[PDB]
Write a protein that binds this ligand. Structure first.
Ligand SMILES: NS(=O)(=O)c1ccc(CCN(Cc2ccco2)C(=O)CN(CCC(=O)O)CCc2ccccc2)cc1
Ligand SMILES: NS(=O)(=O)c1ccc(CCN(Cc2ccco2)C(=O)CN(CCC(=O)O)CCc2ccccc2)cc1
Ligand SMILES: [Zn+2]
Length: 258
């Protein structure tokens, strides 16, 4: 795999090794708020993270993942548009080189500074690798970040990043509560889509929260000090690791709220 976010290996090149990049349900997308229809049949989300067990934080060369114990139903997402139970496996972010870009989804073409993805897999498929082969295999909860006041629940993440500066580095990251990354409201938009990085599999029910979280300039500046490169290689700052909006095609975005 030699895909990335550079001019020579970025999103416009991905289709050559991953032809599904030009598929019928690719993500992210622009959320046109006036065209999304309230669906009164959608249920409230059930975010049940009380028993979450975080384990480790990894710089994988594309972002950093906070990984969870998903060998039992400890942190799960249910309800909303979902049938059944989806286990939290990891979260990560996408962010920009400046505050005016970074998110993958957009809202009436507005780009946020960053976007958090809480990744969950449908337990009816037994493991994540099986789930990604199914149209309802994953549920990703997407949360926009804007720059303003600090997010206290993000600080423990920010302060460990110095220890995973380069690709392949990891660190213990136990006892982290992902509930501190949520906004107050769970109002959301939802639509069927894909992974936003290769292999771009069309296996995701996207649930994008309407309310952004606020993070401080200092917090996002620390994201931007990470490296795409490995240790002992010339520095390539980990910034602009977002895929732009893709064609909506034959899909409808539904809103949980009027
Ligand atoms: N899956 S895809 O999107 O369709 C996709 C896959 C491959 C490429 C080409 C990658 N390119 C262009 C590039 C991209 C960024 C800069 O230059 C390279 O030059 C190859 N080279 C650096 C690629 C890399 O690892 O970044 C690695 C091979 C190599 C050989 C010998 C010694 C060391 C390394 C582009 C897109
Ligand atoms: N931005 S996004 O849309 O939210 C989004 C985009 C990409 C991914 C990546 C998913 N991938 C790559 C992948 C795997 C299969 C297809 O694709 C992995 O997680 C790979 N992982 C190893 C590297 C690692 O995780 O350390 C193993 C996953 C696994 C396989 C089998 C059983 C259990 C777990 C997640 C969310
Ligand atoms: Zn993501």
């Amino acid at each position: 795999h030699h895909w990335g976010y550079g001019k020579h290996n970025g999103p416009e090149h991905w289709h050559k090794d991953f032809p599904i990049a030009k598929g019928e349900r690719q993500s992210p997308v622009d959320i046109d708020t006036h065209t999304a229809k309230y669906d009164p049949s959608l249920k409230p989300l059930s975010v049940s993270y009380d028993q979450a067990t975080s384990l480790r934080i990894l710089n994988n060369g594309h972002a950093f993942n906070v990984e969870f114990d998903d060998s039992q139903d400890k942190a799960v997402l249910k309800g909303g548009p979902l049938d059944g139970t989806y286990r939290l496996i990891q979260f990560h972010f996408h962010w920009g080189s400046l505050d005016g870009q970074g998110s993958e989804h957009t809202v009436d073409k507005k780009k946020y500074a960053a976007e958090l993805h809480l990744v969950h897999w449908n337990t009816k498929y037994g493991d994540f690798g099986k789930a990604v082969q199914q149209p309802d295999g994953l549920a990703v909860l997407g949360i926009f970040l804007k720059v303003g006041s600090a997010k206290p629940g993000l600080q423990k993440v920010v302060d460990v990043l110095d220890s995973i500066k380069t690709k392949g580095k990891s660190a213990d990251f136990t006892n982290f509560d992902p509930r501190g990354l949520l906004p107050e409201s769970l109002d959301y938009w939802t639509y069927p889509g894909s992974l936003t990085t290769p292999p771009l599999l069309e296996c995701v029910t996207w649930i994008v929260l309407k309310e952004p979280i606020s993070v401080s300039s200092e917090q996002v500046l620390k994201f931007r000090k990470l490296n795409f490169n490995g240790e002992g290689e010339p520095e390539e700052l980990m910034v602009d690791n977002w895929r732009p909006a893709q064609p909506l095609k034959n899909r409808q975005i539904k809103a949980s709220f009027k």
